[PDB]
Amino acid sequence: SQGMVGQLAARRAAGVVLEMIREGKIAGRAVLIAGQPGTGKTAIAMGMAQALGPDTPFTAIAGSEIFSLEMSKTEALTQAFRRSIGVHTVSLHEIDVINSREIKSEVREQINAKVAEWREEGKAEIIPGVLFIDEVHMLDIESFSFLNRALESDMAPVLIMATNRGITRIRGTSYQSPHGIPIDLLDRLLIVSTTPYSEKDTKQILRIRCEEEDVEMSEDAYTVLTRIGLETSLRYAIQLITAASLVCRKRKGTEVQVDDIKRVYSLFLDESRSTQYMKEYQDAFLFN
Amino acid sequence: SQGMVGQLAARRAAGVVLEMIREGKIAGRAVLIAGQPGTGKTAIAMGMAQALGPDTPFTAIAGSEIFSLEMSKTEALTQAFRRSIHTVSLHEIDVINSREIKSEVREQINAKVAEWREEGKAEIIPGVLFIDEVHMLDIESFSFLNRALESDMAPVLIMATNRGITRIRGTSYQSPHGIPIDLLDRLLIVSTTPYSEKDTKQILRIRCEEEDVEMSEDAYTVLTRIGLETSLRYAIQLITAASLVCRKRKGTEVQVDDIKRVYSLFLDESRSTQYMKEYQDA
Amino acid sequence: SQGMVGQLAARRAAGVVLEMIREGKIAGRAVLIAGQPGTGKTAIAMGMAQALGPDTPFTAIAGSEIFSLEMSKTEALTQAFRRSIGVRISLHEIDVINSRTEIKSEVREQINAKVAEWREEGKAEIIPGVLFIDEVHMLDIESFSFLNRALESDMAPVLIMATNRGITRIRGTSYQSPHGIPIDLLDRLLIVSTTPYSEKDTKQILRIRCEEEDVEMSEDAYTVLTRIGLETSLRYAIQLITAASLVCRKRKGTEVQVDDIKRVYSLFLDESRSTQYMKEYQDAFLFN
Amino acid sequence: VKSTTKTQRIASHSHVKGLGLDESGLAKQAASGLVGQENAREACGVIVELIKSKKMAGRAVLLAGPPGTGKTALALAIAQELGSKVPFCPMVGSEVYSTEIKKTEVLMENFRRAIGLRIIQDVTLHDLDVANTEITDKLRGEINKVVNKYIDQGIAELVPGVLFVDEVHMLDIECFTYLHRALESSIAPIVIFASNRGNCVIRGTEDITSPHGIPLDLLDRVMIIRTMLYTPQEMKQIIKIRAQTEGINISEEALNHLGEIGTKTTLRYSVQLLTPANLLAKINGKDSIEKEHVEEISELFYDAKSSAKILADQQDKYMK
Amino acid sequence: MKIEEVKSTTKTQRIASHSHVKGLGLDESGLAKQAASGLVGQENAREACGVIVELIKSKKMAGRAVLLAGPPGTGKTALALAIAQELGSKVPFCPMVGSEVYSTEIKKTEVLMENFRRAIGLRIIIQDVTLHDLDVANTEITDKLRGEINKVVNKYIDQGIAELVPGVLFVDEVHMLDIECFTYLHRALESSIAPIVIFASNRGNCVIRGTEDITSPHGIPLDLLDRVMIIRTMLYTPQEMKQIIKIRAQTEGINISEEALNHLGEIGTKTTLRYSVQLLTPANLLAKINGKDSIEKEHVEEISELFYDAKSSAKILADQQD
Amino acid sequence: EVKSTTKTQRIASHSHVKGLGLDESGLAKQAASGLVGQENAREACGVIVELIKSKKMAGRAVLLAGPPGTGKTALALAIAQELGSKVPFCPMVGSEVYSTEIKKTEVLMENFRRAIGLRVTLHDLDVANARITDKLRGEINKVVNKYIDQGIAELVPGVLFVDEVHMLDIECFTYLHRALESSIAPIVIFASNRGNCVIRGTEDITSPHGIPLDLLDRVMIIRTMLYTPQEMKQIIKIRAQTEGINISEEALNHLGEIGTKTTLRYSVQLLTPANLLAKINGKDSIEKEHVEEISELFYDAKSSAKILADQQD
Ligand SMILES: Nc1ncnc2c1ncn2[C@@H]1O[C@H](COP(=O)(O)OP(=O)(O)O)[C@@H](O)[C@H]1O
Ligand SMILES: Nc1ncnc2c1ncn2[C@@H]1O[C@H](COP(=O)(O)OP(=O)(O)O)[C@@H](O)[C@H]1O
Ligand SMILES: Nc1ncnc2c1ncn2[C@@H]1O[C@H](COP(=O)(O)OP(=O)(O)O)[C@@H](O)[C@H]1O
């Protein structure tokens, strides 16, 4: 249903989290979504945005997105929370570009007070959104400190963080913590675990994407491809499809045959074989 | 006597140093006092301040005190020497004429002082500076002292330390006491030895007197025994917390039972770490 | 002939490199003169300066001259290339003329554009020089990046680099390359290897240096002085002569004898014995 | 009054009203919310009487013990009983690292707030710092001269509060020196540190190893207190006290099963499964939380260590 | 915002070593030929690039990129050049090395934002022109000017007057770009005017530049490595390697005996193909000094004695030092 | 114009060094002009004195490698003695370059100017011509090249002693490499007691004595050897004489083993404090009793830290 396939564990757990959001009992927590890369961590976060409301704001910013020279880290994070709060309804960072034009920090606090008035007025009304920070172990203690100050606010959104890392050095210090998050915050997190896809789960996924890219396919070429997916990676299999049709439709086959999937699998490699060929050449060159 | 006890070696060695101070021969030297934490290094340094004169300026800055985000290191150290030299010191005069300090207002006061001093109106007397945990300082600050000791009005420097061979902070070389070798060839080094059992008892007997707290003879040998087992700093801590328990049950004066209770409640750094390294491994 | 002695391998290869300079085929390359210290790397480079021109500019700057207090690396390097570019009816020379105090990028493009006028004018003519950067492994990726932006130039001079190190971590990176040069540049270099001087080659050299201070010498002296030369360094033995004559002239001997060379060899040490003695003492107190 | 006191931090400590000691100074098994932990409870009782008897000149307090053993709770207890409306300021050590504000302004703002004046209007030194633009050190000395004057005039009394600095091993060598210098003054509050780490390299020196990550300059002015882990039988008693204060009905067996998670992970985790467990019961239309629920949450949500256990252990076989 | 087809910068030295590469030389259904349009061998990879040519024309390359992994001296700049040739009609090609972004006199974001604009051209009674030229015609580079020219250039296509020919951006030594450079690209590859990015790398599992615990394939981040299509290149056979050299000599006008390729080929098998190809010119000039038309095996054995490859020369100095 | 604020406090331990005590031949007398023993190195300095007088020291320096407390400064001070009357000598330690209130190039370029004098040092001509900056450096030198042209006043270059050379970073060496090229430079005498050291500021390059190879080549190295107990007593006997300290014959023997145990710098330092302790007991001279005590009271540096580490155990 709605593009979910399997992942019943996280889907259920995500369900529970909505209730503490609806019941107003989420204040001073967060959600962390732990699991291998490309196991629908984004989707489960996208899901909660949808199911929670018709106009709920949503923002998807990665960890490594903050290390850019565009502005400070604080400006980048501040702009994120400001965007992920809706008040037709338009977000607070949307309002900042009108009533400003960088932004003077005075402009922000200026708009804030005016908004507490119209909200209190009973003409304007506030709704929290959802912020999603992928790859969270990239952030550092100077940015984690900002979040705890940010969650303490009354109009704060719900924060959801994802990661695919176990015990790791907290970026910015010399200590190790689970998920590279400071321990002051991990005791407030609700951790939700996503497991890798099964065999049948994988097949269903490709079959959905083929529909999305209008590509005919044989049941043999469908299950020969799913086999690849479980052996290497799901984001590889999905890569091959569009490239597979263009070989089949080259010879005007139209319905993809196993020959093409055997062929195009031999032409574009995946990151595993790419390294191992490099690694082999590296060491034989180091030989003598 | 300044209620000195024990330290028979360092006390005498300190005595010899006063003569080269009085004979005008301490110029181009300094005093280093090596020894374990809590063996009267500040006291022995406080002693020489006393015996050298009734009004000698004395200054206590620790080594790590220079790491201030308020001021740079040079102000931190300059304000030390200026502070350590009716009668008043330069740094106290520095704030009046500087009604942070302007760099010109110091050199200004120096010229004005060279007149009144050479005049025969005022007299300058050097004091004593004490820099505890000197290994914290770095080569950027050691360079300053050597330039600072060259002045005619400079005080005598007394540096304490409880470390052996150590990396000179700011470089990649290991030097004794973390001091550069250009400076150790000028220092007079004095070693302070740990206290015996008898020496310990007399110390704790004085501080109970200092705070108006009685004790039984058993308590002293117990409390002194704790002193030798853990640290004199810890034992001296237990007393005030000891009296408040003895006075709790309306006892007159502290007994062994109360040293028992106040012991099992408050802990020292040795037991505190082991009763937590057991959890750390697990 | 012409002062060069031995180095018969590099002398010939240096000869070929002139031809790619004369035939206009050096563009987009450079010369690296690899070889242990004190094997005439500067000489063979200076030979190309002599052999190529009557007025050819020449600059001898080490790598460590770039790490200076009173200018950026770009400033110091840029002034080198400016100076080593000849012009007559060098660019850095004119820059104190058409400027007056500092030189600016806008000032430079001015004189460069004006020079594009007088060159094609037919009246003024430009001729490239030779830049010699000894101790090249000192440079970093910020300086190598500048060279690749420099050698592409239309009046760029020929770059000659020296070095006495094998693999090195490129200063500025976490990566190791042969000769401490980035791999993007080493595929554009012509490498010449210089071999250490033979015995007869050494003796001939000293005989030239002695002549320069009108210092006369006995035959056994040369034979003994060469032995120290091959044993320690050509750059050491040449140091002893000047000092040697002053002992001979001290006893009005008129001509250096082995007693003097045996004497002054006993008074002034060399870097080998110097360290050994330090390292012997360095250990004993360290033992305790 | 600026009414800026935080509440979402102390939310997990609403039940703690006192230290629960008899007149003599021996702990009762449970009173004023606290349960067990008698040794530390008795020790805090002594610390209470040195603060009132003015014997705590300069000294601080350290609560060394494993996480989830009542460190913050004991600190909060002392403040309420010691005086009416005495301020409590919890802070984690990692709050000093912020880009938009200097370290000194982080420590001082909490330090000033922990102190209040009883004129009658009770207000914290920090409200007078925001009542009297930007607040610099010149402004603080002035208020202390105008506040030390009011109390001396009988008009108001100074009630010093509690400053709880959790994760002390994260404050660098510069923050401590800023504390040590302030801890000697007379208007400061009582500083209570807390640590669950043994000997650690003092943040900012890369060579010094001192206990708990504190300098020896300041470590000789601290009174250490240990806390021991809670027993399975005490563990179940604490959670029942939180389930009540939340107005949550829990089954007797499930209170046992939730207690064992306490022994497995931490007391802070087991308590945090109450709320989500309750909502899962509302989904199935129940009043109380039955064992099915707690067995359900305990398989949906994960404690921190086990999750990284899964991923890292999957990571050896995931990549080769 | 004037159009300047004439005003341009072309690095002669970079095209010169691939002057012979005219087309990917694919025919039929993309089947490779042993020798076609200058290329030789590399049949596996040549066939694949033929597919990428189609994905680009059929507009399927939605935010994808290309990675050519393989040992150095295997035809990786050549193939990426041919793809630019095969898209046809003088599409831009901007070869750059990863280590160029570290420059002191210019920010990293400018060095990349620049090289992209050189690779997207606009064929607009008509004269082609690159987006960078419309910036230089637009002495200040601003983030406002960017979107303006993106609206001005894309208002012309949207008027139907203008057609956009996006070219190829070849970034070699990709493992030398730090994170901030990859995240700059990562948004630029999202745009609709962007060119094709063709990365290239010969290292293996490389840690991202900076103090990063992450170990990533080819030193690329994981977020960007997902939008990459990897193609492998294989080492050249002695026999193929000769047929490469014979083509460079023909393009330089150099007459060389058979035994001179048989020997010059083997040195390629030992060191690289880039080293062997470089020896042609210096061999020829020495062949002129001895007054011969063609290069005899004596000249290759001679140059081989004078000039060294970096991988051996450094080996000598370290060991003779030791 | 001159306050002459020269480091007298620094040279106070060298008052007895009058010259190199050279003999008529290249050999020098076993004991003369204050110095004692260390003959081999003394003779070499005799050669360095000639190359300076014969103007052959163009570009070169001197390196005095040897263990600590073997008479490095004393020779370097003596060399300034032999080069005429009242020639500048500016002893500086290498770690003085690291300063907060001053650029490294200042305090180096400054000591260099303090050491070249006229007939009045070139550093005096910057405070006297002060706005001392690099613009004014290039001006008074040519403004003084003119005076030698006129013969009004003659330039005598002095000696510069840079101790602890291994503490100067790669930037300082490149600076001296420049100014040692100019024609108004003094004789730079480095001193080091360490073998191969990573050149400060490079973290990978190892060179002899911590000196870069470009500068390590224009250097003439001279080794000094440790003193015998025999000779070491004579030096301590010489310092006592110059300080008016009567010392017992037995004490010099007990004060000569303590030297060879630790250093010569240490034993010379124990004289003054030993004397005052004898004044306490109202003695004319220093008896063995005293040195038996000061050896107990004060400690040499390495032994003190030796004790504290063992107390760490
Ligand atoms: N002695 C106690 N009696 C009852 N509840 C307690 C006691 N100590 C702690 N708690 C509660 O247990 C939970 C976790 O303990 P907490 O004090 O927060 O851990 P930490 O030890 O790291 O500070 C909180 O709900 C807290 O209020
Ligand atoms: N298949 C080929 N066809 C034609 N020329 C080739 C072929 N393979 C390599 N070359 C030539 O070899 C040289 C190296 O190009 P390339 O291999 O891309 O450099 P790199 O190997 O470092 O990527 C160029 O001359 C290129 O044209
Ligand atoms: N040859 C000598 N004869 C007499 N006294 C000497 C001699 N050499 C050094 N001294 C004295 O011994 C001490 C050693 O100083 P010195 O070792 O020269 O400096 P450094 O330790 O830096 O090398 C000084 O008091 C010096 O004057």
Curated annotation (Swiss-Prot), chain B:
Amino acids binding ATP: G35, Q36, P37, G38, T39, G40, K41, T42
Q: Which residues cross the membrane?
A: none
Stretches of the chain forming a coiled coil according to its record: none
| Catalysed reaction, written as an equation | ATP + H2O = ADP + phosphate + H(+)
Q: What class of enzyme is it?
A: hydrolase
Entry superkingdom: Eukaryota
| UniProt note on tissues of expression | Ubiquitously expressed. Highly expressed in testis and thymus.
- Chain residue numbers at which the record places covalent cross-link Glycyl lysine isopeptide (Lys-Gly) (interchain with G-Cter in SUMO2): K277
Per the record, the major location class is: nucleus
InterPro entries, alphabetized: AAA+_ATPase, P-loop_NTPase, RuvB-like, RuvB-like_C, RuvBL1/2_DNA/RNA_bd_dom, TIP49_P-loop
Q: What SUPFAM superfamilies has UniProt attached to this entry?
A: P-loop containing nucleoside triphosphate hydrolases
In the UniProt annotation, what is the result of changing K41M? No effect on interaction with NOPCHAP1
The EC number on file is: 3.6.4.12
> What SMART domains would the database entry show?
AAA (SM00382)
The Gene Ontology terms for molecular function here are: ADP binding; ATP binding; ATP hydrolysis activity; ATPase binding; beta-catenin binding; chromatin DNA binding; DNA helicase activity; identical protein binding
Write out the function statement from the record.
Possesses single-stranded DNA-stimulated ATPase and ATP-dependent DNA helicase (5' to 3') activity; hexamerization is thought to be critical for ATP hydrolysis and adjacent subunits in the ring-like structure contribute to the ATPase activity. Component of the NuA4 histone acetyltransferase complex which is involved in transcriptional activation of select genes principally by acetylation of nucleosomal histones H4 and H2A. This modification may both alter nucleosome -DNA interactions and promote interaction of the modified histones with other proteins which positively regulate transcription.
How are the domains described in the entry?
Answer: The C-terminal domain is required for association with ATF2.
Protein name (Swiss-Prot/TrEMBL) = RuvB-like 2
Question: From which organism does this entry originate?
Answer: Homo sapiens
Question: What does the organism's lineage look like at the top?
Answer: Eukaryota, Metazoa, Chordata, Craniata, Vertebrata
Curated annotation (Swiss-Prot), chain D:
Give the highest taxon in the source lineage. Answer: Eukaryota
General remark:
High level of autoantibodies against RUVBL1 are detected in sera of patients with autoimmune diseases such as polymyositis/dermatomyosistis and autoimmune hepatitis.
Q: Spell out the InterPro entries in the cross-references.
A: AAA+_ATPase (IPR003593), P-loop_NTPase (IPR027417), RuvB-like (IPR027238), RuvB-like_C (IPR041048), RuvBL1/2_DNA/RNA_bd_dom (IPR042487), TIP49_P-loop (IPR010339)
Q: What is the effect of changing D166N?
A: Abolishes ATPase activity; inhibition of MYC- and CTNNB1-mediated transformation
Q: What EC numbers are recorded for this enzyme?
A: 3.6.4.12
- Give the comment on domains: Binding to MYC is dependent on a Myc domain essential for oncogenic activity.
Family classification = Belongs to the RuvB family.
UniProt GO MF annotations: ADP binding; ATP binding; ATP hydrolysis activity; ATPase binding; cadherin binding; DNA helicase activity; TBP-class protein binding; TFIID-class transcription factor complex binding
Q: Kindly state the subunit structure of this protein.
A: Forms homohexameric rings. Can form a dodecamer with RUVBL2 made of two stacked hexameric rings; however, even though RUVBL1 and RUVBL2 are present in equimolar ratio, the oligomeric status of each hexamer is not known. Oligomerization may regulate binding to nucleic acids and conversely, binding to nucleic acids may affect the dodecameric assembly. Interaction of the complex with DHX34 results in conformational changes of the N-terminus of the RUVBL2 subunits, resulting in loss of nucleotide binding ability and ATP hydrolysis of the complex.
The GO cellular component terms are:
centrosome; ciliary basal body; cytosol; dynein axonemal particle; extracellular exosome; Ino80 complex; membrane; MLL1 complex
Q: Does the keyword Acetylation apply?
A: yes
The cross-link described as Glycyl lysine isopeptide (Lys-Gly) (interchain with G-Cter in SUMO2) comes at K309
Q: Which reaction does it catalyse?
A: ATP + H2O = ADP + phosphate + H(+)
Positions with a binding annotation for ATP:
G65, P66, P67, G68, T69, G70, K71, T72
Task: Identify the SUPFAM superfamilies for this entry.
Answer: P-loop containing nucleoside triphosphate hydrolases
| Localization of this protein | Nucleus matrix; Nucleus, Nucleoplasm; Cytoplasm; Membrane
Q: Name one GO biological process term.
A: regulation of DNA-templated transcription
Residues annotated with N6-acetyllysine modification: K317
Q: What name has this protein been given in UniProt?
A: RuvB-like 1
Curated annotation (Swiss-Prot), chain E:
Enzyme class name: hydrolase
- Reported EC number(s) for this entry are 3.6.4.12
User: Single Gene Ontology BP term?
Assistant: positive regulation of double-strand break repair via homologous recombination
Q: Where is it located?
A: Nucleus matrix; Nucleus, Nucleoplasm; Cytoplasm; Membrane
- Chain positions recorded as ATP binding sites: G70, P71, P72, G73, T74, G75, K76, T77
Q: In which tissues is it expressed?
A: Ubiquitously expressed with high expression in heart, skeletal muscle and testis.
Identify the main location: nucleus
Q: Which GO molecular function annotation, any one, does this entry have?
A: ATP hydrolysis activity
- Reactions mediated catalytically: ATP + H2O = ADP + phosphate + H(+)
Domain of life, per lineage: Eukaryota
Coiled-coil positions: none
Q: Which UniProt keywords apply?
A: Acetylation, Activator, ATP-binding, Cell cycle, Cell division, Chromatin regulator, Cytoplasm, Cytoskeleton, DNA damage, DNA recombination, DNA repair, Growth regulation, Helicase, Hydrolase, Isopeptide bond, Membrane, Mitosis, Nucleotide-binding, Nucleus, Transcription, Transcription regulation, Ubl conjugation
Q: Which GO terms describe its cellular component?
A: centrosome; ciliary basal body; cytosol; dynein axonemal particle; extracellular exosome; Ino80 complex; membrane; MLL1 complex
Could you say what the effect of mutating E173Q is? Reduces ATPase activity. Decreases interaction with NOPCHAP1. No effect on formation of RUVBL1-RUVBL2 heteromeric complex
Q: Where is this cross-link: Glycyl lysine isopeptide (Lys-Gly) (interchain with G-Cter in SUMO2)?
A: K2, K315
State whether it acts alone or in a complex, and with which partners, per the record.
Forms homohexameric rings. Can form a dodecamer with RUVBL2 made of two stacked hexameric rings; however, even though RUVBL1 and RUVBL2 are present in equimolar ratio, the oligomeric status of each hexamer is not known. Oligomerization may regulate binding to nucleic acids and conversely, binding to nucleic acids may affect the dodecameric assembly. Interaction of the complex with DHX34 results in conformational changes of the N-terminus of the RUVBL2 subunits, resulting in loss of nucleotide binding ability and ATP hydrolysis of the complex.
- Additional facts recorded: High level of autoantibodies against RUVBL1 are detected in sera of patients with autoimmune diseases such as polymyositis/dermatomyosistis and autoimmune hepatitis.
**UniProt family annotation:** Belongs to the RuvB family.
Gene name, Swiss-Prot/TrEMBL:
RUVBL1
